[PDB]
Amino acid sequence: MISLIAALAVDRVIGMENAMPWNLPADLAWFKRNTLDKPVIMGRHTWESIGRPLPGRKNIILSSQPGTDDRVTWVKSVDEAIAACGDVPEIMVIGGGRVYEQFLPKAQKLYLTHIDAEVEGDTHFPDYEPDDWESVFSEFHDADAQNSHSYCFEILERR
Amino acid sequence: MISLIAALAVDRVIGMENAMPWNLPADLAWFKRNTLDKPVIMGRHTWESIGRPLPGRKNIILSSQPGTDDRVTWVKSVDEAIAACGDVPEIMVIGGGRVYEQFLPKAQKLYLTHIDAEVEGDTHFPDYEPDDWESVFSEFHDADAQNSHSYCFEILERR
Numbered sequence A, B: 001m002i003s004l005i006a007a008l009a010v011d012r013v014i015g016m017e018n019a020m021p022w023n024l025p026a027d028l029a030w031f032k033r034n035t036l037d038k039p040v041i042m043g044r045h046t047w048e049s050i051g052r053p054l055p056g057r058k059n060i061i062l063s064s065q066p067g068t069d070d071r072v073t074w075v076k077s078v079d080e081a082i083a084a085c086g087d088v089p090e091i092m093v094i095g096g097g098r099v100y101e102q103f104l105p106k107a108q109k110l111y112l113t114h115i116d117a118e119v120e121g122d123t124h125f126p127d128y129e130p131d132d133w134e135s136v137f138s139e140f141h142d143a144d145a146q147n148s149h150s151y152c153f154e155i156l157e158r159r
Protein backbone atom coordinates (compact mmCIF):
# COMPACT_ATOMS: atom_id res chain seq x y z
CA MET A 1 0.00 0.00 0.00
CA ILE A 2 1.02 3.60 -0.18
CA SER A 3 1.82 5.69 2.92
CA LEU A 4 2.78 9.40 3.28
CA ILE A 5 5.37 10.61 5.77
CA ALA A 6 5.86 14.29 6.69
CA ALA A 7 6.77 16.79 9.47
CA LEU A 8 4.19 19.63 9.70
CA ALA A 9 4.61 22.87 11.51
CA VAL A 10 1.48 24.91 12.54
CA ASP A 11 -0.94 25.37 9.60
CA ARG A 12 0.50 22.37 7.92
CA VAL A 13 3.56 24.18 6.76
CA ILE A 14 6.02 21.65 5.33
CA GLY A 15 8.69 23.86 3.52
CA MET A 16 10.02 27.40 3.37
CA GLU A 17 12.34 29.24 1.13
CA ASN A 18 15.31 28.01 3.13
CA ALA A 19 16.05 25.17 5.58
CA MET A 20 13.37 24.71 8.31
CA PRO A 21 14.26 26.52 11.58
CA TRP A 22 14.40 23.52 13.85
CA ASN A 23 16.73 20.85 15.06
CA LEU A 24 14.96 17.54 15.60
CA PRO A 25 17.20 14.55 15.71
CA ALA A 26 14.37 12.44 17.18
CA ASP A 27 12.11 13.29 14.31
CA LEU A 28 14.76 12.21 11.87
CA ALA A 29 15.28 9.04 13.83
CA TRP A 30 11.51 8.31 13.55
CA PHE A 31 11.57 9.07 9.76
CA LYS A 32 14.45 6.59 9.33
CA ARG A 33 12.80 3.95 11.36
CA ASN A 34 9.64 4.20 9.38
CA THR A 35 11.26 4.29 5.95
CA LEU A 36 14.12 1.85 6.33
CA ASP A 37 13.98 -1.10 3.92
CA LYS A 38 11.25 0.49 1.98
CA PRO A 39 11.22 2.25 -1.28
CA VAL A 40 10.79 6.02 -0.98
CA ILE A 41 9.33 8.28 -3.68
CA MET A 42 10.26 11.98 -3.67
CA GLY A 43 10.17 14.96 -5.99
CA ARG A 44 13.26 16.63 -7.47
CA HIS A 45 13.43 19.56 -5.09
CA THR A 46 13.30 17.20 -2.17
CA TRP A 47 16.06 15.11 -3.78
CA GLU A 48 18.23 18.18 -4.30
CA SER A 49 17.71 19.03 -0.72
CA ILE A 50 18.74 15.71 0.64
CA GLY A 51 22.00 15.64 -1.15
CA ARG A 52 22.63 11.94 -1.42
CA PRO A 53 20.58 8.89 -1.72
CA LEU A 54 18.94 7.77 1.53
CA PRO A 55 20.95 4.75 2.74
CA GLY A 56 19.23 1.53 2.86
CA ARG A 57 16.23 2.32 0.84
CA LYS A 58 15.36 2.34 -2.84
CA ASN A 59 15.22 5.94 -3.97
CA ILE A 60 12.82 6.92 -6.61
CA ILE A 61 12.67 10.43 -8.09
CA LEU A 62 9.49 11.65 -9.73
CA SER A 63 10.18 14.41 -12.17
CA SER A 64 9.48 15.63 -15.62
CA GLN A 65 13.09 16.52 -16.21
CA PRO A 66 16.07 14.30 -16.92
CA GLY A 67 17.83 12.41 -14.25
CA THR A 68 21.06 13.84 -12.92
CA ASP A 69 22.27 10.96 -10.74
CA ASP A 70 22.98 7.30 -11.59
CA ARG A 71 22.49 6.13 -8.04
CA VAL A 72 18.73 6.52 -8.09
CA THR A 73 15.76 5.82 -10.22
CA TRP A 74 14.14 8.53 -12.12
CA VAL A 75 10.49 8.23 -13.20
CA LYS A 76 8.15 10.45 -15.12
CA SER A 77 4.70 9.59 -13.76
CA VAL A 78 2.96 8.41 -10.65
CA ASP A 79 2.19 5.16 -12.46
CA GLU A 80 5.78 4.79 -13.38
CA ALA A 81 6.77 5.54 -9.78
CA ILE A 82 4.55 2.84 -8.38
CA ALA A 83 5.65 0.23 -10.86
CA ALA A 84 9.21 0.83 -10.12
CA CYS A 85 8.52 -0.13 -6.47
CA GLY A 86 7.81 -3.60 -7.49
CA ASP A 87 6.10 -5.94 -5.17
CA VAL A 88 6.52 -4.53 -1.73
CA PRO A 89 3.99 -4.24 0.97
CA GLU A 90 4.27 -0.53 1.61
CA ILE A 91 5.46 2.43 -0.43
CA MET A 92 6.55 5.59 1.33
CA VAL A 93 6.11 8.96 -0.31
CA ILE A 94 8.36 11.65 1.23
CA GLY A 95 7.34 14.90 -0.43
CA GLY A 96 7.36 17.57 -1.33
CA GLY A 97 3.92 19.27 -1.52
CA ARG A 98 3.12 18.40 -5.07
CA VAL A 99 4.10 14.84 -4.71
CA TYR A 100 2.14 14.67 -1.50
CA GLU A 101 -0.94 16.03 -3.27
CA GLN A 102 -0.70 13.66 -6.14
CA PHE A 103 -0.31 10.62 -3.90
CA LEU A 104 -2.86 11.39 -1.10
CA PRO A 105 -5.80 9.90 -2.99
CA LYS A 106 -4.14 6.50 -3.15
CA ALA A 107 -2.85 6.64 0.38
CA GLN A 108 -4.09 4.45 3.19
CA LYS A 109 -1.75 5.68 5.98
CA LEU A 110 -0.12 8.88 7.22
CA TYR A 111 2.87 9.11 9.47
CA LEU A 112 2.93 12.67 10.67
CA THR A 113 5.10 14.66 13.06
CA HIS A 114 3.32 17.84 14.31
CA ILE A 115 5.84 20.37 15.36
CA ASP A 116 5.03 23.31 17.55
CA ALA A 117 6.58 25.94 15.37
CA GLU A 118 4.89 28.94 13.96
CA VAL A 119 6.48 29.83 10.57
CA GLU A 120 5.62 31.42 7.20
CA GLY A 121 5.71 28.74 4.65
CA ASP A 122 6.16 28.28 1.07
CA THR A 123 4.50 24.89 0.69
CA HIS A 124 1.99 23.06 2.86
CA PHE A 125 0.77 19.46 3.34
CA PRO A 126 -2.48 18.92 1.43
CA ASP A 127 -5.64 19.46 3.42
CA TYR A 128 -6.94 16.17 4.82
CA GLU A 129 -10.25 15.56 6.49
CA PRO A 130 -10.01 14.22 9.97
CA ASP A 131 -13.38 12.56 9.66
CA ASP A 132 -11.78 10.39 6.98
CA TRP A 133 -8.71 9.30 9.08
CA GLU A 134 -8.31 7.27 12.23
CA SER A 135 -5.57 8.14 14.68
CA VAL A 136 -4.05 4.82 15.78
CA PHE A 137 -0.98 6.07 17.58
CA SER A 138 0.16 9.35 19.08
CA GLU A 139 3.10 10.36 21.21
CA PHE A 140 3.93 13.85 22.55
CA HIS A 141 7.40 15.10 23.41
CA ASP A 142 8.74 18.44 24.74
CA ALA A 143 11.85 20.13 23.37
CA ASP A 144 14.97 18.90 25.20
CA ALA A 145 18.75 19.15 25.10
CA GLN A 146 18.83 17.83 21.63
CA ASN A 147 15.41 18.83 20.08
CA SER A 148 14.56 22.49 19.56
CA HIS A 149 10.79 22.29 19.64
CA SER A 150 8.12 20.08 21.05
CA TYR A 151 6.60 17.56 18.62
CA CYS A 152 4.09 14.85 18.40
CA PHE A 153 4.24 11.62 16.39
CA GLU A 154 1.00 10.43 14.92
CA ILE A 155 -0.01 7.53 12.66
CA LEU A 156 -3.36 7.68 10.83
CA GLU A 157 -5.14 5.08 8.87
CA ARG A 158 -7.79 5.72 6.28
CA ARG A 159 -11.33 4.93 7.49
CA MET B 1 45.96 31.31 24.81
CA ILE B 2 42.35 30.79 25.63
CA SER B 3 39.58 31.22 23.14
CA LEU B 4 35.81 31.30 23.41
CA ILE B 5 33.65 30.05 20.61
CA ALA B 6 29.93 30.61 20.51
CA ALA B 7 26.76 30.93 18.41
CA LEU B 8 24.72 34.03 19.21
CA ALA B 9 21.23 34.90 18.26
CA VAL B 10 19.93 38.49 18.18
CA ASP B 11 20.80 40.38 21.31
CA ARG B 12 23.49 37.90 22.29
CA VAL B 13 21.02 35.23 23.45
CA ILE B 14 22.60 31.82 23.79
CA GLY B 15 21.39 28.40 24.71
CA MET B 16 20.52 27.69 28.24
CA GLU B 17 19.36 24.00 28.20
CA ASN B 18 17.05 23.03 25.17
CA ALA B 19 18.56 22.96 21.69
CA MET B 20 18.44 26.32 19.77
CA PRO B 21 15.80 26.81 17.05
CA TRP B 22 17.91 26.85 13.99
CA ASN B 23 19.71 24.43 11.70
CA LEU B 24 23.14 25.59 10.44
CA PRO B 25 25.33 22.87 9.25
CA ALA B 26 27.81 25.54 7.94
CA ASP B 27 28.12 26.79 11.46
CA LEU B 28 28.78 23.30 12.93
CA ALA B 29 31.50 22.77 10.29
CA TRP B 30 33.05 26.06 11.39
CA PHE B 31 32.85 24.96 14.94
CA LYS B 32 34.51 21.65 14.09
CA ARG B 33 37.33 23.13 11.91
CA ASN B 34 38.16 25.62 14.69
CA THR B 35 38.21 23.21 17.56
CA LEU B 36 39.63 20.02 16.08
CA ASP B 37 42.85 18.70 17.65
CA LYS B 38 42.48 21.11 20.52
CA PRO B 39 41.16 20.79 24.08
CA VAL B 40 37.63 21.93 24.75
CA ILE B 41 36.22 23.06 28.03
CA MET B 42 32.46 22.95 28.52
CA GLY B 43 29.78 23.00 31.35
CA ARG B 44 27.32 20.19 32.21
CA HIS B 45 24.42 21.47 30.07
CA THR B 46 26.63 21.65 26.96
CA TRP B 47 27.84 18.09 27.64
CA GLU B 48 24.21 16.81 27.62
CA SER B 49 23.43 18.80 24.49
CA ILE B 50 26.38 17.20 22.78
CA GLY B 51 25.56 13.72 23.93
CA ARG B 52 29.04 12.02 23.52
CA PRO B 53 32.66 13.08 23.46
CA LEU B 54 33.59 15.42 20.60
CA PRO B 55 35.98 13.29 18.59
CA GLY B 56 39.58 14.37 17.99
CA ARG B 57 39.44 16.78 20.87
CA LYS B 58 40.29 16.55 24.54
CA ASN B 59 36.92 16.93 26.33
CA ILE B 60 37.04 18.64 29.68
CA ILE B 61 33.89 19.13 31.69
CA LEU B 62 33.73 21.91 34.34
CA SER B 63 31.07 21.09 36.94
CA SER B 64 30.20 20.94 40.68
CA GLN B 65 28.83 17.50 39.93
CA PRO B 66 30.01 13.89 39.41
CA GLY B 67 31.74 12.46 36.44
CA THR B 68 29.15 10.10 35.10
CA ASP B 69 31.43 9.13 32.16
CA ASP B 70 35.05 7.93 31.88
CA ARG B 71 35.90 9.05 28.33
CA VAL B 72 36.19 12.73 29.32
CA THR B 73 37.95 14.70 32.02
CA TRP B 74 35.81 16.06 34.85
CA VAL B 75 37.05 19.07 36.77
CA LYS B 76 35.64 21.17 39.56
CA SER B 77 37.38 24.57 38.93
CA VAL B 78 38.84 26.89 36.30
CA ASP B 79 42.34 26.35 37.44
CA GLU B 80 41.83 22.58 37.32
CA ALA B 81 40.37 22.85 33.76
CA ILE B 82 43.30 24.85 32.56
CA ALA B 83 45.95 22.57 33.96
CA ALA B 84 44.07 19.62 32.40
CA CYS B 85 44.71 21.09 29.04
CA GLY B 86 48.42 20.93 29.49
CA ASP B 87 50.76 22.93 27.24
CA VAL B 88 49.07 23.85 24.04
CA PRO B 89 48.85 26.83 21.84
CA GLU B 90 45.05 27.35 22.08
CA ILE B 91 42.36 26.19 24.47
CA MET B 92 38.80 26.30 23.28
CA VAL B 93 36.03 27.18 25.77
CA ILE B 94 32.70 26.04 24.29
CA GLY B 95 30.07 27.20 26.77
CA GLY B 96 27.49 27.48 28.27
CA GLY B 97 26.91 30.93 29.72
CA ARG B 98 28.48 30.59 33.12
CA VAL B 99 31.46 28.87 31.67
CA TYR B 100 31.80 31.73 29.20
CA GLU B 101 31.56 34.27 32.08
CA GLN B 102 34.37 32.58 33.90
CA PHE B 103 36.89 32.37 31.14
CA LEU B 104 36.13 35.67 29.42
CA PRO B 105 38.45 37.73 31.56
CA LYS B 106 41.33 35.39 30.62
CA ALA B 107 40.40 35.19 26.97
CA GLN B 108 42.49 36.50 24.21
CA LYS B 109 40.28 35.52 21.35
CA LEU B 110 36.64 35.12 20.36
CA TYR B 111 35.16 33.18 17.40
CA LEU B 112 31.56 34.16 17.15
CA THR B 113 28.70 33.26 14.91
CA HIS B 114 26.02 35.99 14.79
CA ILE B 115 22.77 34.45 13.70
CA ASP B 116 19.86 36.40 12.46
CA ALA B 117 17.28 34.74 14.58
CA GLU B 118 15.03 36.22 17.20
CA VAL B 119 14.91 33.81 20.09
CA GLU B 120 13.40 34.47 23.47
CA GLY B 121 15.89 33.59 26.12
CA ASP B 122 17.31 34.01 29.59
CA THR B 123 21.02 33.65 29.06
CA HIS B 124 23.25 35.96 27.04
CA PHE B 125 26.81 35.80 25.99
CA PRO B 126 28.78 37.99 28.47
CA ASP B 127 29.02 41.64 27.54
CA TYR B 128 32.26 42.26 25.68
CA GLU B 129 33.33 45.84 25.06
CA PRO B 130 34.47 45.92 21.44
CA ASP B 131 36.94 48.67 22.24
CA ASP B 132 38.86 46.09 24.12
CA TRP B 133 38.46 43.75 21.22
CA GLU B 134 39.48 44.34 17.64
CA SER B 135 37.36 42.70 15.05
CA VAL B 136 39.81 40.96 12.76
CA PHE B 137 37.70 38.82 10.46
CA SER B 138 34.04 39.05 9.45
CA GLU B 139 32.23 37.05 6.80
CA PHE B 140 28.52 37.02 6.20
CA HIS B 141 26.43 34.32 4.70
CA ASP B 142 22.81 34.28 3.58
CA ALA B 143 20.40 31.51 4.58
CA ASP B 144 20.05 28.74 2.04
CA ALA B 145 18.52 25.35 1.43
CA GLN B 146 20.74 23.94 4.08
CA ASN B 147 21.02 26.84 6.58
CA SER B 148 17.86 28.06 8.23
CA HIS B 149 19.05 31.65 8.79
CA SER B 150 21.65 34.24 7.89
CA TYR B 151 24.84 34.07 9.91
CA CYS B 152 28.08 35.93 10.16
CA PHE B 153 31.45 34.44 11.30
CA GLU B 154 33.57 36.88 13.28
CA ILE B 155 36.94 36.68 15.05
CA LEU B 156 37.93 39.20 17.63
CA GLU B 157 41.32 39.78 19.26
CA ARG B 158 41.86 41.18 22.68
CA ARG B 159 43.68 44.45 22.65
Ligand SMILES: Nc1nc(=O)c2cc(CNc3ccc(C(=O)N[C@@H](CCC(=O)O)C(=O)O)cc3)cnc2[nH]1
Binding pocket: A005, A006, A007, A027, A028, A029, A030, A031, A032, A033, A046, A049, A050, A054, A055, A094, A095, A112, A113
Ligand atom coordinates in the same frame (compact mmCIF):
# COMPACT_ATOMS: atom_id res chain seq x y z
N1 LIG C 1 8.77 12.96 10.05
C1 LIG C 1 9.36 13.51 8.96
N2 LIG C 1 10.39 14.30 9.21
C2 LIG C 1 11.23 15.04 8.19
O1 LIG C 1 12.30 15.84 8.49
C3 LIG C 1 10.86 14.82 6.84
C4 LIG C 1 11.82 15.26 5.81
C5 LIG C 1 11.34 14.86 4.60
C6 LIG C 1 12.20 15.23 3.26
N3 LIG C 1 13.72 15.67 3.64
C7 LIG C 1 14.65 14.84 4.30
C8 LIG C 1 15.97 15.54 4.63
C9 LIG C 1 16.87 14.67 5.27
C10 LIG C 1 16.57 13.38 5.56
C11 LIG C 1 17.59 12.54 6.23
O2 LIG C 1 18.77 12.92 6.19
N4 LIG C 1 17.32 11.37 6.70
C12 LIG C 1 18.31 10.53 7.24
C13 LIG C 1 18.20 10.91 8.65
C14 LIG C 1 19.48 10.66 9.56
C15 LIG C 1 18.92 9.34 10.41
O3 LIG C 1 17.67 8.81 10.13
O4 LIG C 1 19.87 8.82 11.42
C16 LIG C 1 17.82 9.12 6.98
O5 LIG C 1 18.68 8.16 6.92
O6 LIG C 1 16.62 8.89 6.85
C17 LIG C 1 15.50 12.88 5.27
C18 LIG C 1 14.45 13.49 4.64
C19 LIG C 1 10.09 14.08 4.47
N5 LIG C 1 9.34 13.70 5.32
C20 LIG C 1 9.77 14.06 6.61
N6 LIG C 1 9.04 13.37 7.66
Ligand SMILES: Nc1nc(=O)c2cc(CNc3ccc(C(=O)N[C@@H](CCC(=O)O)C(=O)O)cc3)cnc2[nH]1
Binding pocket: B005, B006, B007, B027, B028, B029, B030, B031, B032, B046, B049, B050, B054, B055, B094, B095, B112, B113
Ligand atom coordinates in the same frame (compact mmCIF):
# COMPACT_ATOMS: atom_id res chain seq x y z
N1 LIG D 1 29.76 28.43 16.40
C1 LIG D 1 29.32 27.71 17.29
N2 LIG D 1 28.33 26.88 16.91
C2 LIG D 1 27.68 25.97 17.70
O1 LIG D 1 26.71 25.22 17.15
C3 LIG D 1 28.13 25.93 19.09
C4 LIG D 1 27.65 24.83 19.96
C5 LIG D 1 28.31 24.69 21.16
C6 LIG D 1 27.92 23.67 22.06
N3 LIG D 1 26.94 22.79 21.43
C7 LIG D 1 27.37 21.90 20.56
C8 LIG D 1 26.48 20.90 20.07
C9 LIG D 1 26.87 19.88 19.07
C10 LIG D 1 28.21 19.79 18.50
C11 LIG D 1 28.60 18.72 17.48
O2 LIG D 1 27.85 17.70 17.28
N4 LIG D 1 29.77 18.94 16.77
C12 LIG D 1 30.44 18.08 15.86
C13 LIG D 1 30.11 18.37 14.35
C14 LIG D 1 29.10 17.33 13.73
C15 LIG D 1 28.79 17.97 12.47
O3 LIG D 1 29.52 19.12 11.96
O4 LIG D 1 27.69 17.37 11.95
C16 LIG D 1 31.77 18.30 15.95
O5 LIG D 1 32.49 17.33 15.58
O6 LIG D 1 32.25 19.39 16.36
C17 LIG D 1 29.14 20.75 18.97
C18 LIG D 1 28.61 21.87 20.11
C19 LIG D 1 29.42 25.68 21.40
N5 LIG D 1 29.85 26.64 20.62
C20 LIG D 1 29.13 26.76 19.42
N6 LIG D 1 29.68 27.63 18.55
Ligand SMILES: [Ca+2]
Binding pocket: A134, A135, A136, A137
Ligand atom coordinates in the same frame (compact mmCIF):
# COMPACT_ATOMS: atom_id res chain seq x y z
CA1 LIG E 1 -7.39 6.03 18.19
Ligand SMILES: [Cl-]
Binding pocket: A042, A043, A044, A045, A046, A047, A095, A096, A097, A099
Ligand atom coordinates in the same frame (compact mmCIF):
# COMPACT_ATOMS: atom_id res chain seq x y z
CL1 LIG F 1 9.93 17.93 -4.18
Ligand SMILES: [Cl-]
Binding pocket: B042, B043, B044, B045, B046, B047, B095, B096, B097, B099
Ligand atom coordinates in the same frame (compact mmCIF):
# COMPACT_ATOMS: atom_id res chain seq x y z
CL1 LIG G 1 26.84 24.51 30.27
